[PDB]
């Protein structure tokens, strides 16, 4: 019921503005706010207080605190996040780079 009610609340402001937005986007947004149980705020206290990699959380707002807690608690980063691959300066798993291209030597003789 909290989920459906949240969807109604968001949809209301959209329809009030006199605009149309597809069901997909609003559904995705609502679901993200409810996948950890309860209601989760969209804040710097609402996704930087849960693990996603030290870089991904530190990039948004409070950099030094997140980094210090990371080094203190010996945290490990998986480094498949978007911002992480951006910072390191190499290909990320998004779109074209979400798959590797290979070669088949058995196909060259065709």
């Amino acid at each position: 019921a909290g989920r459906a009610a949240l969807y109604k609340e968001v949809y209301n402001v959209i329809a009030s503005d006199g605009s149309y937005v597809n069901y997909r986007h609003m559904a995705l947004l609502v679901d993200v706010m409810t996948t950890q149980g309860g209601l989760t705020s969209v804040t710097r206290h609402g996704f930087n207080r849960s693990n996603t990699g030290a870089l991904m959380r530190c990039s948004f707002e409070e950099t030094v605190e997140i980094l210090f807690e990371a080094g203190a608690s010996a945290e490990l980063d998986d480094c498949r996040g978007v911002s992480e691959n951006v910072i390191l300066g190499q290909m990320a798993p998004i779109g074209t780079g979400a798959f590797d291209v290979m070669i088949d030597e058995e196909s060259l003789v065709k």
Binding site: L6, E9, V10, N12, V13, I14, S16, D17, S19, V21, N22, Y23, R24, H25, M26, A27, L28, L29, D31, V32, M33, T35, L39, T40, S41, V42, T43, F47, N51, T52, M56, F60, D78, R80, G81, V82, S83, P93, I94, G95, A98, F99
Partner: protein, 267 residues
């Protein structure tokens, strides 16, 4: 806040929306698996119309004179009348449409029949009539088993998930139920033999076009849907009893413990 809120969310090669850490937000993107660039507003002919119009349209009787079939519609209309098998098939199709009407009554309680769905059937029908020179006062070479079995064979060709297990087929049927109801509504024996007067190559061409466009309306795996949603919500925010607008949006996104106008709607 919206951009940095929805960023590391994408769709992998399994038609399942999950972030980089593997947390599943949605088992199917948009709960249907369709991109937002191939959806068009369609009308549901199952709920629309009165009961007398519903029974007047979706009943093609062969052994009864209440909703009998006009033999001048098709070439073999003199031999279709009096057949028990085709009448049983018409009973199964009619019962299926009635069950679809009860289901649509339970899903949409507002009474609206216009909803965004993929594949435009009207343009395919018009392109078939203007392509095969289908005009009025032209007997068709189709029968009841060709349209019924044609639709039943087209309903199995619609595939979004490429699995074969129990849960995969259950999610496929539950994700294709509405579209199959729309196809069973627009593809009735009376609607094709009476109004459209489609032939064999025209009907098969319509089936191939519906299946084809359905295979093109599938969302591609690997598309950033979180950023697209954050933009699709943040863009209308620029154009901006209870409080509305930007403050209300702030209270909703921040999930505040107190609202500007805490009101109820007691029914």
């Amino acid at each position: 806040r919206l951009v940095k809120a929805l960023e590391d969310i994408m769709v992998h090669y399994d038609n399942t929306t999950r972030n980089s850490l593997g947390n599943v937000i949605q088992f199917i993107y948009g709960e249907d698996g369709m991109d937002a660039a191939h959806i068009e507003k369609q009308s549901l002919d199952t709920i629309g119309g009165s009961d007398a119009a519903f029974e007047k349209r979706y009943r093609v009787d062969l052994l009864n004179t209440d909703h009998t079939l006009d033999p001048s519609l098709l070439e073999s209309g003199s031999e279709i009348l009096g057949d028990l098998k085709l009448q049983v098939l018409l009973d199964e199709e009619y019962k299926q449409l009635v069950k679809d009407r009860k289901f649509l009554r339970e899903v949409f309680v507002d009474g609206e029949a216009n909803w965004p769905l993929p594949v435009n059937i009207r343009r395919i029908i018009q392109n078939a009539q203007q392509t095969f020179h289908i005009d009025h006062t032209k007997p068709s070479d189709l029968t009841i088993k060709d349209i019924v079995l044609g639709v039943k064979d087209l309903q199995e060709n619609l595939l979004v998930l490429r699995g074969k297990n129990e849960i995969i087929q259950n999610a496929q049927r539950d994700a294709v139920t509405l579209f199959c109801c729309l196809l069973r509504s627009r593809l009735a024996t009376r609607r094709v033999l009476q109004e459209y007067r489609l032939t064999k190559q025209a009907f098969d061409w319509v089936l191939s076009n519906i299946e084809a466009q359905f295979l093109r309306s599938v969302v591609h795996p690997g598309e950033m849907v979180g950023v697209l949603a954050a933009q699709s919500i943040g863009e209308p925010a620029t154009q901006m009893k209870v409080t509305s607008g930007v403050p209300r949006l702030k209270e909703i996104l921040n999930v505040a413990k107190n609202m500007k106008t805490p009101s109820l709607t007691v029914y």
